[PDB]
Nucleic acid binder design. Structure first.
Ligand SMILES: [Mg+2]
Ligand SMILES: [Mg+2]
Ligand SMILES: [Mg+2]
Ligand SMILES: [Mg+2]
Ligand SMILES: [Mg+2]
Ligand SMILES: [Mg+2]
Ligand SMILES: [Mg+2]
Ligand SMILES: [Mg+2]
Ligand SMILES: [Mg+2]
Ligand SMILES: [Mg+2]
Ligand SMILES: [Mg+2]
Ligand SMILES: [Mg+2]
Ligand SMILES: [Mg+2]
Ligand SMILES: [Mg+2]
Ligand SMILES: [Mg+2]
Ligand SMILES: [Mg+2]
Ligand SMILES: [Mg+2]
Ligand SMILES: [Mg+2]
Ligand SMILES: [Mg+2]
Ligand SMILES: [Mg+2]
Ligand SMILES: [Mg+2]
Ligand SMILES: [Mg+2]
Ligand SMILES: [Mg+2]
Ligand SMILES: [Mg+2]
Ligand SMILES: [Mg+2]
Ligand SMILES: [Mg+2]
Ligand SMILES: [Mg+2]
Ligand SMILES: [Mg+2]
Ligand SMILES: [Mg+2]
Ligand SMILES: [Mg+2]
Ligand SMILES: [Mg+2]
Ligand SMILES: [Mg+2]
Ligand SMILES: [Mg+2]
Ligand SMILES: [Mg+2]
Ligand SMILES: [Mg+2]
Ligand SMILES: [Mg+2]
Ligand SMILES: [Mg+2]
Ligand SMILES: [Mg+2]
Ligand SMILES: [Mg+2]
Ligand SMILES: [Mg+2]
Ligand SMILES: [Mg+2]
Ligand SMILES: [Mg+2]
Ligand SMILES: [Mg+2]
Ligand SMILES: [Mg+2]
Ligand SMILES: [Mg+2]
Ligand SMILES: [Mg+2]
Ligand SMILES: [Mg+2]
Ligand SMILES: [Mg+2]
Ligand SMILES: [Mg+2]
Ligand SMILES: [Mg+2]
Ligand SMILES: [Mg+2]
Ligand SMILES: [Mg+2]
Ligand SMILES: [Mg+2]
Ligand SMILES: [Mg+2]
Ligand SMILES: [Mg+2]
Ligand SMILES: [Mg+2]
Ligand SMILES: [Mg+2]
Ligand SMILES: [Mg+2]
Ligand SMILES: [Mg+2]
Ligand SMILES: [Mg+2]
Ligand SMILES: [Mg+2]
Ligand SMILES: [Mg+2]
Ligand SMILES: [Mg+2]
Ligand SMILES: [Mg+2]
Ligand SMILES: [Mg+2]
Ligand SMILES: [Mg+2]
Ligand SMILES: [Mg+2]
Ligand SMILES: [Mg+2]
Ligand SMILES: [Mg+2]
Ligand SMILES: [Mg+2]
Ligand SMILES: [Mg+2]
Lengths: 222, 51, 148, 185, 53, 156
RNA sequence: GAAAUUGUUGAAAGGGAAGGGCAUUUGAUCAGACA
RNA sequence: GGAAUACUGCCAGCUGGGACUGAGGACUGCGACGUAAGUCAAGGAUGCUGGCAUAAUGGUUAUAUGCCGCCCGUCUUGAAACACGGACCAAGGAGUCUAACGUCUAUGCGAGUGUUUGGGUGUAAAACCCAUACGCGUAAUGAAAGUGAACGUAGGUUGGGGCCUCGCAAGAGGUGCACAAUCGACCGAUCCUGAUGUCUUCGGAUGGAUUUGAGUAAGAGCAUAGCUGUUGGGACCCGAAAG
RNA sequence: AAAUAUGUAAGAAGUCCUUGUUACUUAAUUGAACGUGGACAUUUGAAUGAAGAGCUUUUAGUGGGCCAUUUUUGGUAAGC
RNA sequence: GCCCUGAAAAUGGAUGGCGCUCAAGCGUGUUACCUAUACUCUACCGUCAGGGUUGAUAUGAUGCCCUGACGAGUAGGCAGG
């Protein structure tokens, strides 16, 4: 009975192959990411050049935070807060945007904060507070093997492979996203920057869509 | 038994994401963007400074 | 036993699992089947339709046993023959020497026919038979011999 | 706090042991807990639960209900498993051969079975003769032939047999049972 | 929708696979460029209070 | 029996530890701590003594001396965290000090070896100290906070 | 020979009730463990 | 014209001070650094040094201090209540037993089951044994006179665990108990139909019908026990004015 | 003639093809219903969620309610 | 707009009290800072749940081990003691 280092090699040697793949993968997302970022920047200028205005596509992904406690909530929002897995305060989940989710958000605005997340904040959410739902349980990620285990079914075999699937709202975004246990943030470290939380953002409160300004918050709460 | 952050703890940083070496190696996080000098049409400015 | 009993559990709880509002008093519905037609009628129709009133003829001094007449179905029939004795007759199934069965002597009154007896001929003695009980017997070449 | 979507600390509500206290049962169960953990065969998982089953859920399988299930097309050599007791049925004359594997065989049952050159088998014997339950036929007793269910479901227009002692006419057969006494059910 | 489906289902099977025939909710719209040619932005401002009665 | 004894006992077979991963790595000193520097002893026996820094010992302690003859403090060990590093600095390039190790202070009146050692180092130091005027007197004086001092403001 | 309740002796506290919770000063008192 | 800066954002840039925690207990995993042997901050604290070895640390207790703290029981929408009981302490002090029962469960035997009215017997109210009967079940349905459960593999259809065959696997087929849905068949009641026949008014074959039954369609019951529940009893305990 | 509220549908119990059964039905092998044989798998026919779904039996307490924003009746009003 | 008049009740008395006047008042803006049985991370208890493990030749198989979530409570149910 060999295996001593025998099959021990026939793994590690093949453990290397799989990092390699990941390395070539991650390296390439970068090219993608920046040279799309870059692409808009010069779009915006190129239209300014022409006198024309360049309107970038509506955001496709949002990140939501239950900003309100548990009690004295009316039934229909109460459900939607469930269906969106925000069943306790300061917990957050990703939402793919279409009308048929938009209307959901609509309905729960005075109970949540939400907006558009950078790669930076998606990257840091997943790294530090990312957990998988595996037979319920809620497993911390912390080794890419865990992801391949469950999400490999759809491509996706690295924590960054996860992230790429989120941020780009992939074809497998349902499975990808749901795979992540609703994040559990602490309270913001500065504070809310408002004297009173439960007004709209636009009115100097915290709830509703605050667009790119969601990154400043989530980061304070991460 | 004890979750370790990546983001700090370079060890597990590299355990996920083998790219973090080369990223860091090639100061990727500070890419000096290539310089173009396109100038905006006078429509754009006139109307920016309109009333 | 007293010790597995829930009143032991209730010790230390004021109300004995009887509630503080509505207590445990003497007889609130009334005693017994009171208010059958009145405040417990809902219960009596459903759970007990048919309860009130009257149907059918009165029979003064009915003596049961007048009407004694236990039924044995063909269903069994062969049961009445002891199992050792039994197989001997099933195989070797003919007239000339076919088993007699005094079903009165079993303790039955009528032979009904719940169906399927092997083609063995049998001489069946009873007080009473179903029209089919007989046919079935006769199709095996048995007969029914009426006794009392 | 958490908007609970579901009741907290619910028990699965499925049995886990027999509520029995008989060693021998306890042992058989030892066998099949082992056998069902380590053998990826469905039959063992099924059998294990059936041992936890209580008397009601173990209605008797009869030897005549057995003979029928062998009359099953292509099923004449499989071995009937019964996680309960087997009873005799005088109503069938030409019971077949085979192999019955049960918890208990009534005297008449086991008699009839062997009288035609069959074999009666404790389940642990069944275990060793066929770990993965290969070539088994599990039969089940008629659960709903209990007298008690006659009375389940009672109410108007339900056709369901009163909970009633002494019966005959004069026993709930008037008002509410016939169009000429108030009404009908 | 079914007989609609069953057609492009075959029509694209007999072609070269590649179907996609679940309905999808309204997607947020794409980027686009708006020209100024013939269309300079007309600046507006709030009005003062009047009555006319 | 008064009590009915268990049906189980703990094994008294003690486990061995897990193979811990904690390298004792070398302690790099705060920048103000350069040989030749005058320290202020914030505590202990010679609390408030101003005193010259000589060598970093392999048990992280500091090698100081008064010099003895100036202020009475001898060649000694001192923890680097109970000390105020000042800004003033003599030259220790002529003081040997390599002799002095941890074992040199193993507990095991005064061993004349020390009494000799202590004369030799000091004689070198006073040579240097005599260079900058009023230093010797500086060293001889104890440090104390006076009404008004805010260390969180004071430069040393 | 319990309790309520009482005499004595000892200790202690007390600016219009007493008793209680968390916490530590102080006093009194006590375990365990060192080897 | 060419810069700078602010502002917003990014870095898998570097780096300082401080606070809480140190679960785990051989090894095993994922990695990192090394040309290398190795090493490591990579599946949870170790290294070095000192103090007391004691009332030092710690418990308990009394008091002082900061903040906080209304009387319990009860009925009630609502009690600290200007609602009721309660001055104090001991000892008593309230869901029981029984007859008959529903669900559930355990156990014995099983188309049966129940020794204990009784008899036999005894180390004598026990334990041991047992004949005949009886009760409940094994047949239903009509007010009754009465009649009484297979067209068929004890039926067709659909779902169905499990097993069987094919396949490496995915899958496909075969068979399918319990159970559930639906269409039917059989028995009695009701209504219709009324063959062969006859002591000419008896007989009721056969085939039917938006009718109907606590039914049949390869039995599940009987007995002991228990928690909970039901009724009658002084009926959880104490209470009338009366008769 | 709104807003809110509210019925149904979004497939395998689906869509087509061929052509049996009957006492109903048709001028009619016409049709109605129930079938036999065949053709098409999970982008099999929107979203999000699901610590699974379904089902059965038995039994407690309760059957004086009160408050808030909004809708609203009586009343001049009311801590009505 | 703020302020003043309009502006009358019974024990002495209430922006909560002292007191405050370029406020410690009114309207508005910007930061910082204080602290809930809530949130985040960790230990420990218990409840529910999903895994693993009858292999002797030592000690609980209702056991042993890994892991995840959760924890308000009258009347009332059940359970373990
Ligand atoms: Mg979501
Ligand atoms: Mg900060
Ligand atoms: Mg802060
Ligand atoms: Mg700050
Ligand atoms: Mg405020
Ligand atoms: Mg944070
Ligand atoms: Mg007892
Ligand atoms: Mg009792
Ligand atoms: Mg008890
Ligand atoms: Mg209780
Ligand atoms: Mg109690
Ligand atoms: Mg209670
Ligand atoms: Mg009390
Ligand atoms: Mg009760
Ligand atoms: Mg009471
Ligand atoms: Mg009441
Ligand atoms: Mg009556
Ligand atoms: Mg009769
Ligand atoms: Mg029968
Ligand atoms: Mg019956
Ligand atoms: Mg029956
Ligand atoms: Mg090491
Ligand atoms: Mg250092
Ligand atoms: Mg001096
Ligand atoms: Mg005495
Ligand atoms: Mg204390
Ligand atoms: Mg440790
Ligand atoms: Mg430890
Ligand atoms: Mg001591
Ligand atoms: Mg001491
Ligand atoms: Mg005292
Ligand atoms: Mg005290
Ligand atoms: Mg107070
Ligand atoms: Mg009261
Ligand atoms: Mg009142
Ligand atoms: Mg009270
Ligand atoms: Mg009052
Ligand atoms: Mg009263
Ligand atoms: Mg009183
Ligand atoms: Mg007492
Ligand atoms: Mg006697
Ligand atoms: Mg005897
Ligand atoms: Mg006799
Ligand atoms: Mg009977
Ligand atoms: Mg007649
Ligand atoms: Mg059919
Ligand atoms: Mg199949
Ligand atoms: Mg079939
Ligand atoms: Mg009929
Ligand atoms: Mg009728
Ligand atoms: Mg009946
Ligand atoms: Mg009663
Ligand atoms: Mg009285
Ligand atoms: Mg009287
Ligand atoms: Mg009278
Ligand atoms: Mg709707
Ligand atoms: Mg709806
Ligand atoms: Mg859907
Ligand atoms: Mg989902
Ligand atoms: Mg689930
Ligand atoms: Mg109920
Ligand atoms: Mg009720
Ligand atoms: Mg009621
Ligand atoms: Mg409210
Ligand atoms: Mg005022
Ligand atoms: Mg103030
Ligand atoms: Mg102000
Ligand atoms: Mg400030
Ligand atoms: Mg807490
Ligand atoms: Mg609780
Ligand atoms: Mg609860």
């Amino acid at each position: 009975a060999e295996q001593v280092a025998a099959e021990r090699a026939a793994r590690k040697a093949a453990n290397k192959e799989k990092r390699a793949i990941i390395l070539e993968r991650n390296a390439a997302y970068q090219k993608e990411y920046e040279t799309a970022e870059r692409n808009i920047i010069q779009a915006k200028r190129d239209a300014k050049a022409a006198g024309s205005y360049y309107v970038e596509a509506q955001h496709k992904l949002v990140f939501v935070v239950r900003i309100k406690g548990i009690n004295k909530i009316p039934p229909k929002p109460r459900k939607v807060l469930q269906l969106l897995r925000l069943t306790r305060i300061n917990s957050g989940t990703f939402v793919k945007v279409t009308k048929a989710t938009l209307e959901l958000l609509k309905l729960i605005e005075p109970y949540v904060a939400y907006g558009y997340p950078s790669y930076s904040t998606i990257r840091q959410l997943v790294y530090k507070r990312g957990f998988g739902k595996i037979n319920k349980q809620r497993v911390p990620l912390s080794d890419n093997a865990i992801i391949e285990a469950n999400l490999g079914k759809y491509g996706i075999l690295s924590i960054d492979d996860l992230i790429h699937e989120i941020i780009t709202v992939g074809p497998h975004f349902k499975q990808a996203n749901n795979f992540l246990w609703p994040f559990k943030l602490s309270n913001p470290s500065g504070g809310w920057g408002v004297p009173r939380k439960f007004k709209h953002f636009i009115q100097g409160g915290s709830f509703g869509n605050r667009e790119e300004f969601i990154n400043k918050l989530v980061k304070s709460m991460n | 038994v004890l979750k370790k952050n990546p983001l700090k703890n370079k060890q597990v940083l590299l355990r996920l994401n083998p790219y973090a070496k080369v990223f860091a190696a090639e100061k990727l996080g500070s890419k000096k963007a290539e310089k173009t000098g396109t100038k905006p049409a006078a429509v754009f400015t006139e109307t920016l400074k309109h009333d | 036993p007293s010790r597995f009993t829930k009143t032991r559990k209730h010790r230390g709880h004021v109300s004995a699992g009887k509630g503080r509002i509505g207590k445990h008093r003497k007889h609130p519905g009334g005693r017994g089947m009171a208010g059958g037609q009145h405040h417990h009628r809902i219960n009596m129709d459903k759970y007990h339709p048919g309860y009130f009133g009257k149907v059918g003829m009165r029979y003064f001094h009915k003596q049961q046993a007048h009407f004694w007449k236990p039924v044995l179905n063909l269903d069994k029939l062969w049961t009445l023959i002891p199992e050792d004795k039994r197989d001997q007759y099933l195989k070797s199934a003919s007239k000339e020497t076919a088993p007699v069965i005094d079903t009165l002597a079993a303790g039955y009154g009528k032979i009904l026919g719940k169906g399927r007896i092997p083609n063995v001929p049998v001489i069946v003695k009873a007080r009473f038979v179903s029209k089919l009980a007989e046919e079935k017997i006769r199709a095996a070449g048995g007969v029914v011999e009426l006794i009392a | 706090g958490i908007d609970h979507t579901s009741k907290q600390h619910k028990r699965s509500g499925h049995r886990t042991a027999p509520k029995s206290d008989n060693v021998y049962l306890k042992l058989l169960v030892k066998l099949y807990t082992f056998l069902a953990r380590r053998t990826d065969a469905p039959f063992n998982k099924v059998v294990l639960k059936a041992l936890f089953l209580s008397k009601i859920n173990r209605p008797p399988v009869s030897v005549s209900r057995i003979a029928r299930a062998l009359k099953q097309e292509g099923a004449a050599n499989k071995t009937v498993v019964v996680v309960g007791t087997v009873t005799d049925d005088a109503r069938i004359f030409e019971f077949p051969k085979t192999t019955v594997a049960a918890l208990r065989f009534t005297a008449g049952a086991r008699a009839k079975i062997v009288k035609a050159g069959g074999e009666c088998i404790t389940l642990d014997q069944l275990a060793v003769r066929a770990p993965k339950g290969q070539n088994t036929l599990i039969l089940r007793g008629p659960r709903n032939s209990r007298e008690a269910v006659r009375h389940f479901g009672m109410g108007p227009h339900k056709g369901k047999a009163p909970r009633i002692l002494s019966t005959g006419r004069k026993f709930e057969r008037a008002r509410g049972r016939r169009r000429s006494k108030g009404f009908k059910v | 929708r079914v007989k609609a489906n069953a057609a492009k289902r075959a029509e694209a099977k007999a072609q070269g696979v590649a179907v996609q025939l679940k309905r999808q909710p309204a997607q947020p719209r794409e980027s686009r460029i708006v020209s100024t040619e013939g269309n300079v932005p007309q600046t507006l401002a709030p009005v003062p209070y009047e009555t006319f009665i | 029996s008064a009590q009915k004894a268990p049906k189980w006992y703990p094994s008294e077979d003690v486990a061995a530890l897990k193979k811990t991963r904690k390298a004792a790595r070398p302690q790099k000193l705060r920048a103000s701590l350069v040989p030749g520097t005058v320290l202020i002893l914030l505590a202990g026996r010679f609390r408030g003594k101003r005193v010259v820094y000589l060598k970093h010992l392999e048990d992280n302690t500091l090698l100081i001396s008064g010099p003895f003859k100036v202020n009475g403090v001898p060649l000694r060990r001192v923890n680097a965290r109970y000390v105020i590093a000042t800004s003033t600095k003599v030259s220790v390039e002529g003081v040997n000090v390599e002799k002095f190790n941890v074992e040199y202070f193993a507990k095991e009146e005064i061993k004349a070896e020390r009494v000799e050692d202590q004369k030799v180092v000091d004689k070198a130091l006073i040579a240097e100290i005599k260079k900058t005027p009023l230093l010797k007197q500086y060293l001889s004086a104890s440090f104390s906070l006076k009404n008004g001092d805010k260390p969180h403001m004071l430069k040393f």
